[PDB]
Every structure is written in structure tokens, then in C-alpha cells.
Amino acid sequence: MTELLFNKRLQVLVKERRSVIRVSIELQLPSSPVHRKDLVVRLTDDTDLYFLYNLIISEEDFQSLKVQQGLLIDFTSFPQKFIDLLEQCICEQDKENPRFLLQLSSHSPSNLNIVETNADKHLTHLSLKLLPGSDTDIKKYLASCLSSVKEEKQQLQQKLRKTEED
Amino acid sequence: PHMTELLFNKRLQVLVKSKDTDERRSVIRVSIELQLPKDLVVRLTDDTDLYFLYNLIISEEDFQSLKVQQGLLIDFTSFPQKFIDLLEQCICEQDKENPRFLLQLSSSSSAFDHSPSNLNIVETNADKHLTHLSLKLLPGSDTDIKKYLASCLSSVKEEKQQLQQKLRKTEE
């Protein structure tokens, strides 16, 4: 019962270099059933298969976050707000002078920051503490990738089969 | 700069005796590869269980003692082809009522968490039996498994891409 809320590649400033990173956002069943689904955030690389950053945000974890960074929204709304910000980064990343930036700044956790630049001023809209994946996390992620690509391959084979009889 | 060369990779029927588990006949993928980290790498995986992994890394220096333990009078470059010849016998015999060559994977007791398994190639004839090879493999760490799954993923993505390119042409 994991829901995919978002999954796209983004231009990211990794702290320096600018590389395309896949950013995935899901909802999954929490530790305790009373709390709403856990929000999972994952950064990966379509070519460097050992690259993995991840963060799990349960409903209670967000409560701290809300106050820390003065978030006006509710945890139920938070995913959308985060996605809206990511969309802005996307809407902006291909422009002549990008005004919204996605930044990953430093086996220690790194900060995932969405910055809006107002001239020589910089407003930070969201900052997240992402954990470098352990070999165990990566193992699990690779396994889920293998399953999904195989499913796509099987679909492609079915399509080929149907196409060929035509 | 980690180079590799793929000498053998096939499915074999294996009598598997696991730690505190009753015997079982399973299909195990047996891989033999050369690597430049030269190393001979022996790897056992399971197509139906992505977490199953036993391996053994045999450097040329390692082989100096291994060949003594295994009673081998052949050089390092010939060990793969001897191992392969035996594996191919196992495959040819696998469907027989009483296979003359068979592959066993048997756990060895540990007082701790990691239990090695011996991969034995056994020849039998009626009452007689001879163990041609008994390699002591270790259970794969998540590091070993990560490396393997990553190799598999790259391969499957290349396969998917090739299938996509073919469908496109077919589509036209």
C-alpha cells in the first residue's frame, strides 16, 4: 500500500556540481497505524546505481518540522506543498536565469534545500535532512528497481507480441 | 579499474542442506568469473530469491594453498576449466535416477551468525563415492549483494532498451 506521489528527474546543485537527480516521493504505512502514512523521500541516480539518499517523515516527525521551519500547512497538505516547490524548480531549471533552485549540501546526512533567489537575496522554502543510504538500503532499493524494470520489460514483450501479429 | 571476464554462468540442480533445515533440491545459478581488482570469483545465486548469495574470491596467491587443500596438480589458469568440466557432468546427470555426478551445498556449523557452506562436487557409483571438489563459500554480505543486484539492474535496463529499440522499428 505504497502510493507514488511524485517521481521525476531534477537539476540539482550538489555541494560543487550540477547533476540530474531522480527525486521520488511516496506514502507508506507507518510504524503505528494511528498516525497517517509515512512520507518517504528518495534521491537516486539513473546511472550511478550506488547513489542513494533517503528520508522517512512520519506524521509526528513533521510536527517538529512544521514549527522548526514555520510551516503554515498540515502534514496532510505537506506532500503537495513540497511537490509544488519541486514543480517550480522544474518549471525554472530550463530558464535563462533559474529563480528556484534545488540544492543538496553536505557518511553524514545532507540537506535538501529548495531556495528561491530574489536578486542577490535567497529565501529557503524547505530544508530536509537526507540520510546516505547504507549498503542495506541500496540493496533493498536495487531489488525494487529490478522488479519494476522486469515488469516494464514483460509489458514491452506483450506489446511486441501483439504488434507482431499485425 | 575493476575488470571482469565471464567464464561460466548456468543453472544447476543442487542438494541444499541449510543451517538447521532439512535437505532440499534447488536450482542454483553458478557463476565463475575472472576479475582484476587477478581473482577467480565463484558465486551462487538463486533466480527466485534476490537475497540469496554465497561467494568465494580466489586470488592467484590464494590458489597456492587451495590447490593443496583440494589435491590439485593444475595451474591457476586451468582450475576454471576443471571446475567447469565437473559442473557440466552434473548438468548431464541431473535428470537421471541416480546421478553419477551431483552438486551439494552443505552448511557448516558456526557458534556465531555467519555459517559458511561447502559446495561439494560428488561422484558416485553404487556404494562408492568420491568428492572431487569441496569449496568453502561464505554467505554474501549486503555489500556483495548490492554489487550483484547493481550488475543485474544494469543488464536488465540494457535489455529493456534493446527491446524498446526493436519495438520501435517493428512499430514503423
How far apart (Å, rounded) are the C-alpha atoms in residues A12 and A88? 13
Per the CB < 8 Å rule, is A146 touching B170? no
Residue B68: CATH number of its domain: 2.170.210.20
Cα distances (Å, whole numbers) of residue B156 to A140, A151, B127, B159: 17, 11, 46, 5
**Residues in B touching A163 (Cβ below 8 Å):** 167, 170-171
Set of cell numbers at residue A163: 504488434
Strands A100-105 and A38-44: unpaired
Nearest partner of A66 among A53, A56, A58, A75, judged by Cα: A75
Give the long-range contacts of residues B53-62, CB within 8 A, separation 24 or more.
B53/B139, B53/B140, B53/B144, B53/B145, B53/B148, B54/B105, B54/B117, B54/B119, B54/B137, B54/B138, B54/B139, B54/B140, B55/B137, B55/B138, B55/B140, B55/B144, B56/B135, B56/B136, B56/B137, B56/B138
How far apart (Å, rounded) are the C-alpha atoms in residues A41 and A5? 10
How far apart (Å, rounded) are the C-alpha atoms in residues B43 and B150? 15
Looking at residue A15, the DSSP 8-state letter turns out to be -
In chain A, % helix, strand, coil (3-state, to 5) comes to: 35, 40, 30
Q: What is the dihedral of CA B10, B16, B18, B21, to 10 degrees?
A: 140
Neighbours of B53 (CB within 10 A): 21
Neighbours of B63 (CB within 10 A): 19
Looking at residue B76, the DSSP 8-state letter turns out to be T
CA distance between the termini of chain A: 38
Looking at residue B77, the DSSP 8-state letter turns out to be T
Is the separation of the CB atoms in B114 and B138 below 8 Å?
yes
* DSSP bridge pairs for B33: B6, B41
Nearest partner of B32 among B52, B13, B4, judged by Cα: B4
CB-based contact, A96 to chain B, within 8 Å = no
Cα distances (Å, whole numbers) of residue A2 to A8, A27, A138, A145, B160: 17, 6, 18, 15, 25
If you write DSSP's letter for every residue of A112-163 in order, what string do you get?
EEEEEEETTEEEEEEEEEEEEPPHHHHHHHHHHHHHHHHHHHHHHHHHHHHH
Q: What is the CA radius of gyration of chain A?
A: 18
Is the separation of the CB atoms in B26 and B16 below 8 Å?
yes
CA atoms within 13 A on the CB side of A47: 3
CB-based contact, B24 to chain A, within 8 Å = no
Q: What is the CA radius of gyration of chain B?
A: 18
Looking at residue B140, the DSSP 8-state letter turns out to be P
Dmax (CA) for chain B in angstroms is 64
CB-based contact, B165 to chain A, within 8 Å = no
Residue of A146, A154, A158, A159 to mutate, testing the B interface (most B Cβ within 10 Å of its Cβ): A146
Grid cell 543510504 is found at: A133
| Domain tally, chain A | 1
Q: Which domain holds residue B8?
A: 1-172
CB-based contact, B149 to chain A, within 8 Å = yes
Strands A121-132 and B39-46: unpaired
Is the separation of the CB atoms in A81 and A66 below 8 Å?
no
Is the separation of the CB atoms in A144 and A132 below 8 Å?
no
Neighbours of B32 (CB within 10 A): 20
Strands A100-105 and A3-14: parallel
Set of cell numbers at residue B117: 557452506
How far apart (Å, rounded) are the C-alpha atoms in residues B40 and A68? 54
CB-based contact, A138 to chain B, within 8 Å = yes
Sign (positive or negative) of CA dihedral B94, B98, B99, B104: positive
How many Cβ pairs within 8 Å bridge chains A and B? 55
